[PDB]
Write a protein that binds this ligand. Structure first.
Ligand SMILES: O=c1ccn([C@H]2C[C@H](O)[C@@H](COP(=O)(O)NP(=O)(O)OP(=O)(O)O)O2)c(=O)[nH]1
Ligand SMILES: [K+]
Ligand SMILES: [K+]
Ligand SMILES: [K+]
Ligand SMILES: [Mg+2]
Ligand code: NA
Ligand code: NA
Length: 339
DNA sequence: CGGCAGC
DNA sequence: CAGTGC
DNA sequence: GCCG
DNA sequence: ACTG
């Protein structure tokens, strides 16, 4: 089947092609930090296909039979399979490790990394001492090492509980759901994602700013990166937190507050994975629908030229299950969405 | 060849 | 608008 | 990078 | 989607 959102990610639990995917991931990451996002996307999808496959790939013909693998990818797969190496890795530009270093700063992407490299910068100390930094990038740089680590799941638990307890002190009826990789059951988490709503349809209002102010006053929030406080029905905070007590590190924290009617689509989005979401949204589009963090809708409205001019009509979805049902997809628990 | 999710 | 991110 |  |  061609659609990862129609398949359980536990197919990847035994990677029969580890020898191959480890090499391809180096090349994929090189393309990614150079800004070749669509080539890197094609690699990411081929790597998932190899991880998912039910046995070691043993021939070029078999490789080409797998959705997501074409002639070029099959050539590399078979070189690695039969020689143990991928010669193309030997020819990656010496700039790539530096571009990776620079784009590991939160708020600096490929264009900023390229610019710094062209200015002659090569190290994080060069950046700190000489580079022009946005407000977000200066936070990302000062927390560079803390943010590159994935935290143990146990620490993510303490963080999501800190947020939940602070929110429920304002209204005990709030639902506070840890999402992202935490909800998908992972043993380590790049950050903590928290979704908040209230089943009465109204009492989520106002909680966002009260909650951030409370967590700031206790010293739990240490830096803010992005705030969407007033635009529409959903509110979003991206920032930095730190648990109390000795030796604790700074961690990225994302919070979203949504009305109850959008809870299912916000939960589905924020649980991810990102590749799962992109697959499910592309599938919705082929079925004459549109899927976002706000709703599952009928197809967006377009004009004579093909240009989107307005939203489609919302289809009510009380639960995550309803989105899957309306798309004709087998339901997947969060841990099975880890694409 | 152009599109690759939707905010 | 370009860059960046979830 | 792959797909259609 | 915000940021600038
Ligand atoms: O490009 C994206 C990125 C994220 N998302 C959604 C799915 C993802 O699970 C969720 C949270 O984003 P994170 O960057 O926190 N990723 P995740 O929590 O899955 O993994 P990590 O352990 O790296 O945070 O937002 C997208 O839809 N598109
Ligand atoms: K497998
Ligand atoms: K194929
Ligand atoms: K990065
Ligand atoms: Mg996360
Ligand atoms: Na970055
Ligand atoms: Na996040």
């Amino acid at each position: 089947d061609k659609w990862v959102c129609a398949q359980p990610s536990s197919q990847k639990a035994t990677n029969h092609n580890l020898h191959i995917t480890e090499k391809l991931e180096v090349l994929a990451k090189a393309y990614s930090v150079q800004g070749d996002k669509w080539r890197a996307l094609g690699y990411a999808k081929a790597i998932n296909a190899l991880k998912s496959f039910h046995k070691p790939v043993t021939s070029y013909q078999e490789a080409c039979s797998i959705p997501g693998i074409g002639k070029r990818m099959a050539e590399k797969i078979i070189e690695i399979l039969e020689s143990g190496h991928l010669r193309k890795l030997d020819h990656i530009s010496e700039s790539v490790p530096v571009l990776e270093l620079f784009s590991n700063i939160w708020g600096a992407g490929t264009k900023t990394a390229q610019m710094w490299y062209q200015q002659g910068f090569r190290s994080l100390e060069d950046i700190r001492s000489q580079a022009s930094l946005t407000t977000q990038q200066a936070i990302g740089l000062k927390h560079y090492s803390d943010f590159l680590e994935r935290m143990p799941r146990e620490e993510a638990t303490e963080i999501e509980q800190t947020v939940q307890k602070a929110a429920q002190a304002f209204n005990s009826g709030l639902l506070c759901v840890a999402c992202g990789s935490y909800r998908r059951g992972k043993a380590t988490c790049g950050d903590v994602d928290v979704l908040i709503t209230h089943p009465d349809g109204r009492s989520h209002r106002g909680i966002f700013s009260r909650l951030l102010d409370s967590l700031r006053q206790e010293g739990f929030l240490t830096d803010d990166l992005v705030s969407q406080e007033e635009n529409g029905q959903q509110q979003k905070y991206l920032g930095v937190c730190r648990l109390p007590g000795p030796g604790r590190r700074h961690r990225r924290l994302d919070i979203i507050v949504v009305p109850y009617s959008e809870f299912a689509c916000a939960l589905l989005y924020f649980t991810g994975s990102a590749h799962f979401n992109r697959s499910m949204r592309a599938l919705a589009k082929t079925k004459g629908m549109s899927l976002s963090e706000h709703a599952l809708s009928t197809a967006v409205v377009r004009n004579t030229h093909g240009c989107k001019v307005g939203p489609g009509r919302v289809l009510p979805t009380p639960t995550e299950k309803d989105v899957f049902r309306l798309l004709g997809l087998p339901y997947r628990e969060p841990a099975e969405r880890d694409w």
